[PDB]
Amino acid sequence: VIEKVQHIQLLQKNVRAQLVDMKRLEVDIDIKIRSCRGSCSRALAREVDLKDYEDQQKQLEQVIA
Amino acid sequence: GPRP
Amino acid sequence: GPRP
Amino acid sequence: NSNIPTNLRVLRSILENLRSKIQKLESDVSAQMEYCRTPCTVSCNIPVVSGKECEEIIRKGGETSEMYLIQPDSSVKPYRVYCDMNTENGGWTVIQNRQDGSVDFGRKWDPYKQGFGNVATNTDGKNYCGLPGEYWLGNDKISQLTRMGPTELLIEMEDWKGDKVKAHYGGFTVQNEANKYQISVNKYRGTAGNALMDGASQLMGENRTMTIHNGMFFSTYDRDNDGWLTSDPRKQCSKEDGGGWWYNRCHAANPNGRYYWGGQYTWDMAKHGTDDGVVWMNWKGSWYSMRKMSMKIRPFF
Amino acid sequence: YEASILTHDSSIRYLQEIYNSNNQKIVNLKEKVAQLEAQCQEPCKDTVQIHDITGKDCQDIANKGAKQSGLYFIKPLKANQQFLVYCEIDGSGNGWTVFQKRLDGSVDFKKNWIQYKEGFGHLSPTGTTEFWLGNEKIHLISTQSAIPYALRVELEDWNGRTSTADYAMFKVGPEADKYRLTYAYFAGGDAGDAFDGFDFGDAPSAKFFTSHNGMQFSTWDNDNDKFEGNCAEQDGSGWWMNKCHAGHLNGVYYQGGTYSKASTPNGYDNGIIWATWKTRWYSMKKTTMKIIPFNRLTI
Numbered sequence: 001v002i003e004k005v006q007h008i009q010l011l012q013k014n015v016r017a018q019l020v021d022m023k024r025l026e027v028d029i030d031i032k033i034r035s036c037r038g039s040c041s042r043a044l045a046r047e048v049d050l051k052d053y054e055d056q057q058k059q060l061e062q063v064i065a
Numbered sequence: 066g067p068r069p
Numbered sequence: 070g071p072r073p
Numbered sequence: 074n075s076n077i078p079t080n081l082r083v084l085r086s087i088l089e090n091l092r093s094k095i096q097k098l099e100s101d102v103s104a105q106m107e108y109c110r111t112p113c114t115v116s117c118n119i120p121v122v123s124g125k126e127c128e129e130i131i132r133k134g135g136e137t138s139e140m141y142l143i144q145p146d147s148s149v150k151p152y153r154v155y156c157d158m159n160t161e162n163g164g165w166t167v168i169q170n171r172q173d174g175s176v177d178f179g180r181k182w183d184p185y186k187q188g189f190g191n192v193a194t195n196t197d198g199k200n201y202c203g204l205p206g207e208y209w210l211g212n213d214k215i216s217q218l219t220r221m222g223p224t225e226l227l228i229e230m231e232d233w234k235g236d237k238v239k240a241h242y243g244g245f246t247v248q249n250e251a252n253k254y255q256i257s258v259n260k261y262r263g264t265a266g267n268a269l270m271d272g273a274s275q276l277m278g279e280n281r282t283m284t285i286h287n288g289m290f291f292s293t294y295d296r297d298n299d300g301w302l303t304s305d306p307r308k309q310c311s312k313e314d315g316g317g318w319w320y321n322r323c324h325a326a327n328p329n330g331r332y333y334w335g336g337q338y339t340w341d342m343a344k345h346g347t348d349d350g351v352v353w354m355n356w357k358g359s360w361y362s363m364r365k366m367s368m369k370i371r372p373f374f
Numbered sequence: 375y376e377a378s379i380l381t382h383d384s385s386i387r388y389l390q391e392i393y394n395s396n397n398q399k400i401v402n403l404k405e406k407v408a409q410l411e412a413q414c415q416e417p418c419k420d421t422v423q424i425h426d427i428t429g430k431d432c433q434d435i436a437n438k439g440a441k442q443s444g445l446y447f448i449k450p451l452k453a454n455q456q457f458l459v460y461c462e463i464d465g466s467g468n469g470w471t472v473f474q475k476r477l478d479g480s481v482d483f484k485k486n487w488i489q490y491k492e493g494f495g496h497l498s499p500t501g502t503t504e505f506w507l508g509n510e511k512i513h514l515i516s517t518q519s520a521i522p523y524a525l526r527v528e529l530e531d532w533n534g535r536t537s538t539a540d541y542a543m544f545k546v547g548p549e550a551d552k553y554r555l556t557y558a559y560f561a562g563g564d565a566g567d568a569f570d571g572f573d574f575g576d577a578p579s580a581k582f583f584t585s586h587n588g589m590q591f592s593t594w595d596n597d598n599d600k601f602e603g604n605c606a607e608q609d610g611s612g613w614w615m616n617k618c619h620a621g622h623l624n625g626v627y628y629q630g631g632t633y634s635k636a637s638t639p640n641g642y643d644n645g646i647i648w649a650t651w652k653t654r655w656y657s658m659k660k661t662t663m664k665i666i667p668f669n670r671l672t673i
């Protein structure tokens with residue numbers, strides 16, 4: 001627990017939270033955009049890739065060790 | 066239609 | 070889902 | 074000691090990836106906002122045959138499944154509904170339908186009271202709407218239909234693999250608004266498991282009991298009539314599990330949940346960690362959002 | 375390769391600067407996602423809409439202001455509930471209540487008793503769909519106290535020509551009397567009086583056996599014609615059969631107009647005919663049966 005080590009202890013926690021926070025917004029946006037298909041002229045065709053997020057979340061843990 |  |  | 078380096082890397086690597094992901098999302102959302110400057114449209118010519126409800130209509134000769142106009146009672150003004158005239162002898166008035174996530178189901182008390190979504194869409198080419206859309210008939214209407222006389226309920230679903238199951242209910246009623254649209258069901262049977270009456274199949278005692286829907290009041294994210302005695306405003310069921318439902322504490326079935334593409338989903342995707350999404354625990358568990366989910370009624374003989 | 379320790383001080387801050395920046399961009403995106411939501415609450419707009427003006431019939435509605443044709447709800451005097459109908463409103467305050475329409479052979483007119491009783495087909499605001507309003511409704515509209523109606527029939531061949539036929543005091547009886555057709559007299563029309571029967575030059579009684587005034591409605595599953603056989607079944611329609619007909623507006627829709635004996639399953643003429651205007655082997659391209667109060671048809 002040094003000056004720099006503390007700064008990075010938090011940076012891991014923060015990115016682990018943003019990783020989750022994003023992984024969700026990603027899903028929220030997919031469902032929301034789709035739910036406009038029955039209301040708006042059209043719904044942006046798209047496909048969500050969770051792997052990239054999951055691959056990174058396991059990646060973070062690999063260095064938090 | 067006149068039937069027989 | 071419950072809320073035990 | 075040389076850990077700080079590989080750490081500042083993996084941290085820099087991800088924060089720049091997320092930066093990109095954000096860029097993609099602001100793109101997608103900005104594009105959708107534009108497409109929404111104009112609406113989607115349909116053209117549904119109205120069938121001549123009409124009646125108090127779908128059962129009367131089929132008995133009157135309307136033998137095809139499409140949008141029909143019905144008038145449960147002289148008081149009410151005639152309104153559109155989708156009639157399933159093929160499943161189990163037809164005559165089924167559709168009150169709830171899920172199939173493509175095209176409609177938003179996380180709405181307030183009033184939209185759920187009045188009804189929302191698309192009753193029907195055009196049958197590719199035709200002038201009538203022989204295809205059903207995603208919708209919630211409306212609590213006032215559903216309550217009035219069930220109170221006309223004995224009514225049975227037919228809930229249907231399909232997983233993203235094509236497997237189908239159903240939960241039947243020989244008796245189904247929903248009280249009016251003044252009674253918080255209280256729900257009552259009985260005389261169950263089917264291949265999906267009685268989740269509305271018994272509760273979460275894979276649960277024990279108190280845990281399974283707090284997931285029983287029968288007898289519950291209707292709740293929306295802006296109207297808490299759930300069986301969850303909390304003090305924290307964020308702890309209401311509707312706010313957590315998505316849309317409006319006869320939430321107890323909280324559910325074993327969530328027909329009006331969020332539509333997850335693919336079926337499989339997990340707590341890390343859920344907006345609140347809760348198990349939102351078109352759920353019917355007794356059949357596929359708590360983390361599976363069906364591809365098809367519908368609720369229909371008919372007079373009981 | 376391996377940055378010097380002095381770099382650590384700078385790197386720690388860089389991450390924090392973008393981490394926090396990423397964070398802000400999110401707080402903002404969610405905001406936009408919330409604004410998107412308010413934009414996705416409405417259903418697709420339905421082109422077909424029903425006007426608010428209602429009355430005892432289409433003429434009544436038009437007398438109440440209604441100016442354009444389209445779907446309306448009417449409710450004759452003795453009717454339990456209101457029902458939708460199509461109203462043709464001209465520029466003279468005349469409200470016609472159409473009850474039969476043919477124009478593409480999209481709707482199959484081989485229906486049973488109940489179907490012909492409750493009606494079938496589709497109503498369109500643009501008046502471009504085929505249908506049968508339903509015998510009961512037709513009965514209710516034409517038998518309101520003291521209001522004497524008139525029927526106008528409109529045909530159109532495939533060459534572009536059109537013709538009409540009017541009938542005073544048009545009336546359709548109740549189901550107990552098999553929805554019998556009756557009219558005071560032919561009111562005139564270039565289409566020619568077909569309900570009066572036609573001399574197919576085959577019998578001594580010429581006209582008689584193919585006249586319609588007074589005939590009861592007939593369907594394959596409910597025979598009430600003046601023939602030992604079943605007109606409705608053989609001609610595959612629902613109509614006021616005699617033995618059998620001179621006018622067959624609910625007959626089989628023959629594409630082109632000129633059909634033949636070979637075309638028919640049994641052998642008899644089953645097309646949309648009207649002998650006083652076209653050979654029994656010529657099926658009309660369009661057809662419309664509409665009614666209005668008689669005092670309205672230019673006195």
Ligand SMILES: *[C@@H]1O[C@H](CO[C@@H]2O[C@@H](C)[C@@H](O)[C@@H](O)[C@@H]2O)[C@@H](O[C@@H]2O[C@H](CO)[C@@H](O)[C@H](O)[C@H]2NC(C)=O)[C@H](O)[C@H]1NC(C)=O
Pocket residue numbers: 073276277278279280281
């Ligand atoms: C009722 O549920 C609670 C909440 O736990 C959840 O439900 C369980 C049935 C099981 O599926 C868990 O994995 C879920 O997380 C149970 O909580 C118990 O809590 C005590 C501490 O108070 C703990 O020691 C137990 O291990 C928990 N239950 C177990 C054995 O997992 C509770 O036990 C459940 N009781 C009933 C009625 O089954």
Ligand SMILES: [Ca+2]
Pocket residue numbers: 297298299300301302303309
């Ligand atoms: Ca509560």
Ligand SMILES: [Ca+2]
Pocket residue numbers: 597598599600601602603604605
């Ligand atoms: Ca006969």
